[PDB]
Amino acid sequence: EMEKEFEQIDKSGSWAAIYQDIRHEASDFPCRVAKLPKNKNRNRYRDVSPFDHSRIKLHQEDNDYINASLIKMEEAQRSYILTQGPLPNTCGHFWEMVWEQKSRGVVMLNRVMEKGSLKCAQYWPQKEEKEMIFEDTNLKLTLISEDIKSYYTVRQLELENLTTQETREILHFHYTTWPDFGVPESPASFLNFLFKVRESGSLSPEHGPVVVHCSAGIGRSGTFCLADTCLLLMDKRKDPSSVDIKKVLLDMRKFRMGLIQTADQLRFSYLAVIEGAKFIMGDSSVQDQWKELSHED
Ligand SMILES: CCCCCNC(=O)[C@H](Cc1ccc(OC(C(=O)O)C(=O)O)cc1)NC(=O)N[C@@H](Cc1ccccc1)C(=O)O
């Protein structure tokens, strides 16, 4: 049981030791294409790269590389694309990936600037009347509307392939309150957001994989995907107590390195899965509880 494990670890002050063990047991796979000198300007951080076996390939003639990985969770029957926050020169590639992979939703877990430092490029339009054109990948992006809440904003974007004139509606789910240091005090806001993303239809199997990112696409993004997958498994096994969060995280780590960046994010992932479990288990009023607890106004 994850609840019993959570407490044993918590009371013995062993989060750092459990996290250290996950880092040590994690898979090691080649990072070859990401390290090619030609791709240096496509990586935000030199120590965060997609493995060759699961990297997303752009359907680009000259260079198919993007720092993004396909996390294919077999048992949970869900796939996620985790990528770094796009750089000024990779915003076109980012939207190209979204188009090619047929993604319906984009989940952003950070702010463009945090503690005075740039963490992600301004890749979507902030004003309806000032659309963005990505010349390199021949894409047009327009802000259609935006619903700003106290801890997240949901935007309706229109992505157009200028080559075929085909148009698609992309939903942008932006968590705007991750703390400058550490992790949120409570997982209520994070869970309300996760369920808003589920409710939108963006994680459905009829669409391509949701695109999730933070700055490196491994810590906050890993937290979001780990919690979602754990919750899916708990609803699928129907005996949620067999879900081993450490084992789920290690399967996810076969697809992208360093998912879950600190012991505090691991602890927070347990907290979010344990609390989300209360809804999955049957509490029909707990979703309203997070709605209020997260104080969306
Ligand atoms: C798990 C591997 C990461 C280990 C520590 N690295 C760093 O913090 C960063 C990479 C990094 C990893 C996770 C992060 O997550 C947070 C976020 O996305 O906001 C979050 O989840 O809140 C943010 C950054 N790397 C550099 O800062 N890289 C620098 C310094 C550096 C130079 C040479 C070698 C390694 C690092 C660079 O120039 O690329």
Swiss-Prot record:
Q: Which compartments does it reside in?
A: Endoplasmic reticulum membrane
Q: How does it sit in the membrane?
A: Peripheral membrane protein
Cross-link named N,N-(cysteine-1,S-diyl)serine (Cys-Ser), sites = C214-S215
Tissue expression as described in the entry: Expressed in keratinocytes (at protein level).
At which residues is Cysteine sulfinic acid (-SO2H) found? C214
Q: What is the effect of changing D180A?
A: Substrate-trapping mutant
- For this protein, what reaction is catalysed? O-phospho-L-tyrosyl-[protein] + H2O = L-tyrosyl-[protein] + phosphate
Q: Which residues are annotated with the PTM Phosphoserine? A: S49, S241, S242
Q: What is its EC number?
A: 3.1.3.48
Which residues does the record list as Cysteine sulfenic acid (-SOH) (modified residue)? C214
What job does this protein perform? Tyrosine-protein phosphatase which acts as a regulator of endoplasmic reticulum unfolded protein response. Mediates dephosphorylation of EIF2AK3/PERK; inactivating the protein kinase activity of EIF2AK3/PERK. May play an important role in CKII- and p60c-src-induced signal transduction cascades. May regulate the EFNA5-EPHA3 signaling pathway which modulates cell reorganization and cell-cell repulsion. May also regulate the hepatocyte growth factor receptor signaling pathway through dephosphorylation of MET.
Q: What is this protein called?
A: Tyrosine-protein phosphatase non-receptor type 1
Give the residues of the full protein shown: 2 to 298 of 435
